[PDB]
Motif scaffolding. Structure first.
Motif, short mmCIF file in Angstrom:
data_model
loop_
_atom_site.label_atom_id
_atom_site.label_comp_id
_atom_site.label_asym_id
_atom_site.label_seq_id
_atom_site.Cartn_x
_atom_site.Cartn_y
_atom_site.Cartn_z
N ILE A 51 0.89 -1.39 -0.03
CA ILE A 51 0.22 -0.05 -0.09
C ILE A 51 0.87 1.31 0.12
O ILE A 51 0.79 2.16 -0.86
CB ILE A 51 -0.95 -0.06 1.20
CG1 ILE A 51 -2.10 -1.06 0.91
CG2 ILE A 51 -1.69 1.27 1.15
CD1 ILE A 51 -2.91 -1.33 2.28
N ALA A 52 2.16 1.20 0.86
CA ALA A 52 2.78 2.32 1.00
C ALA A 52 3.47 2.50 -0.44
O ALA A 52 3.69 3.64 -0.97
CB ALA A 52 3.89 2.09 1.93
N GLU A 53 3.93 1.59 -1.25
CA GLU A 53 4.71 1.66 -2.27
C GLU A 53 3.80 1.99 -3.55
O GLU A 53 4.19 2.93 -4.41
CB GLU A 53 5.17 0.09 -2.83
CG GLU A 53 6.24 0.08 -3.73
CD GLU A 53 6.90 -1.19 -4.22
OE1 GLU A 53 7.56 -1.61 -3.18
OE2 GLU A 53 6.74 -1.74 -5.17
N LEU A 54 2.49 1.82 -3.45
CA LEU A 54 1.53 2.25 -4.34
C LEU A 54 1.30 3.84 -4.13
O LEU A 54 0.96 4.39 -5.08
CB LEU A 54 0.17 1.66 -4.03
CG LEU A 54 -0.16 0.45 -5.09
CD1 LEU A 54 0.97 -0.55 -5.09
CD2 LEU A 54 -1.65 0.01 -4.74
N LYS A 55 1.37 4.16 -2.95
CA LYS A 55 1.02 5.60 -2.54
C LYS A 55 2.40 6.46 -3.09
O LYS A 55 2.30 7.54 -3.83
CB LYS A 55 1.17 5.84 -0.97
CG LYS A 55 -0.05 5.16 -0.42
CD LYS A 55 0.05 5.67 1.09
CE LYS A 55 -1.53 5.28 1.76
NZ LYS A 55 -1.29 5.25 3.22
N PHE A 69 -11.07 0.30 -3.19
CA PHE A 69 -11.24 -0.93 -3.41
C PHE A 69 -9.54 -1.68 -3.61
O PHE A 69 -9.54 -2.98 -3.24
CB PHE A 69 -12.02 -1.55 -4.57
CG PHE A 69 -12.19 -2.75 -4.98
CD1 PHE A 69 -13.27 -3.54 -4.31
CD2 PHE A 69 -11.64 -3.66 -5.83
CE1 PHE A 69 -13.25 -4.96 -4.32
CE2 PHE A 69 -11.68 -4.97 -5.98
CZ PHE A 69 -12.67 -5.67 -5.44
N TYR A 70 -8.72 -1.18 -4.12
CA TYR A 70 -7.32 -1.66 -4.14
C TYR A 70 -6.78 -1.95 -2.82
O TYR A 70 -6.20 -2.94 -2.80
CB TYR A 70 -6.70 -0.87 -5.08
CG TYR A 70 -6.76 -1.26 -6.53
CD1 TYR A 70 -6.97 -0.32 -7.44
CD2 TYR A 70 -6.98 -2.58 -7.14
CE1 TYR A 70 -7.29 -0.54 -8.78
CE2 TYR A 70 -6.99 -2.87 -8.42
CZ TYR A 70 -7.22 -1.90 -9.24
OH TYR A 70 -7.56 -1.90 -10.62
N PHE A 71 -6.90 -0.93 -2.02
CA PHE A 71 -6.43 -1.15 -0.83
C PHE A 71 -7.01 -1.97 0.28
O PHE A 71 -6.62 -3.03 0.72
CB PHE A 71 -6.59 0.28 0.17
CG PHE A 71 -5.46 1.42 -0.52
CD1 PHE A 71 -5.51 2.77 -0.21
CD2 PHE A 71 -4.72 1.19 -1.68
CE1 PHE A 71 -4.95 3.66 -0.49
CE2 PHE A 71 -3.92 1.93 -2.26
CZ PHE A 71 -3.93 3.19 -1.81
N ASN A 72 -8.38 -2.13 0.16
CA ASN A 72 -9.27 -2.90 0.72
C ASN A 72 -9.19 -5.05 -0.84
O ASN A 72 -8.97 -5.96 0.24
CB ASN A 72 -9.99 -3.98 -0.33
CG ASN A 72 -10.32 -2.16 1.39
#
Length: 47
Positions: free
Chosen positions: A9-13, A21-24
């Motif tokens: 999630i951090a790397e996506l940020k 929906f991607y985080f969940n």
């Protein structure tokens, strides 16, 4: 499995992905490979 999702999630940020929906998916990810699969898919998709 715990920190892997958070790093994903951090790397996506870092990549510039602020779509929640991607985080969940990532938080629902059953296995680490699935976590990575999601991250790599999202990255390659937006790339």
């Amino acid at each position: 499995l715990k920190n892997a999702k958070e790093d994903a999630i951090a790397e996506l940020k870092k990549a510039g992905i602020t779509s929640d929906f991607y985080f969940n998916a990532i938080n629902k990810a059953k296995t680490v490979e699935e976590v990575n699969a999601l991250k790599n898919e999202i990255l390659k998709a937006h790339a």
